[PDB]
Amino acid sequence: HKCDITLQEIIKTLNSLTEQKTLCTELTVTDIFAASKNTTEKETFCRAATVLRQFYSHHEKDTRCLGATAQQFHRHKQLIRFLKRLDRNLWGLAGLNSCPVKEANQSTLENFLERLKTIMREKYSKCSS
Amino acid sequence: HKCDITLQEIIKTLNSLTEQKTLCTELTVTDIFAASKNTTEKETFCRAATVLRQFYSHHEKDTRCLGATAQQFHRHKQLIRFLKRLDRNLWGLAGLNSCPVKEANQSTLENFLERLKTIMREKYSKCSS
Numbered sequence A, B: 001h002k003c004d005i006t007l008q009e010i011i012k013t014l015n016s017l018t019e020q021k022t023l024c025t026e027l028t029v030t031d032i033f034a035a036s037k038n039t040t041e042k043e044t045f046c047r048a049a050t051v052l053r054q055f056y057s058h059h060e061k062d063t064r065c066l067g068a069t070a071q072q073f074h075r076h077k078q079l080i081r082f083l084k085r086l087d088r089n090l091w092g093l094a095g096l097n098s099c100p101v102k103e104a105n106q107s108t109l110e111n112f113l114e115r116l117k118t119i120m121r122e123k124y125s126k127c128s129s
Helices: A006-018 A042-059 A070-093 A109-127 B004-017 B041-059 B068-094 B109-127
Strands: A028-030 A106-108 B027-030 B104-107
Touching: A006 A109, A028 A042, A028 A109, A042 A070, A042 A109, A042 B027, A070 A106, A070 B004, B004 B041, B004 B068, B004 B109, B027 B041, B041 B068, B041 B109
Parallel strands: none
Antiparallel strands: A028 A106, B027 B104
16 A cells, blocks of 8 residues: 555646546546456556556547647647656556556546546545544 | 356346436445455455445435335335345355455445446456357
8 A cells, every 4th residue: 555645646637637628538448447356556557557548649649639729729738748647657656567458348538537536535545544 | 257147137237226316326335446456356246245235224214215205215115125136146146245345435326336337247248249
């Protein structure tokens, strides 16, 4: 069980990510949380980090997400910035660089981020009085 | 990985449970799915079975849920019927009668049932072509 400041940086990013919806946030990610057994909390971390990396890599220049207006475009840029911030945190927490992602249900990025936010705050609670 | 007909009975109950909201469905259950590591799919099952048992036992005669009208009362009865149906299925699948439930985030029964529905259909997918 790690109780590093890193957890607060994860939660902070999740709070700017979920309050801001874009064109892209309703696209999909493998629902790593549709398993009937997440295994090892560092494996969970590797698992969320791996799926956020797949997302941002493939949607960074996705015509469906870039936007038309400067507002839309700016939001998009911020979405990509935050996913990379969050990923690097996740990877740093995992300290594991290879894990197996085998689920098939997909969820929107939006649901996925909200779930993760929830386990991140549970983690936080088990850490503090 | 079990692929028993039981899974369809679990999904069937979940489908009548989630389409029917009552006075009680917005009350809480320990979010067994706020862990950063569900362990063993039979443990997961034991875990959901244990928390649904706690719910129905304590809310069966909950004045907040019994209802005023015959409609409300009837719905309530059906909610309790289905939770017991689902629990017995879960327990039957677990084949494990003691597991540790240690999370602290709570979710409404409604969110909890929707999540479980999702892992139950993932289970179903990994079972069929």
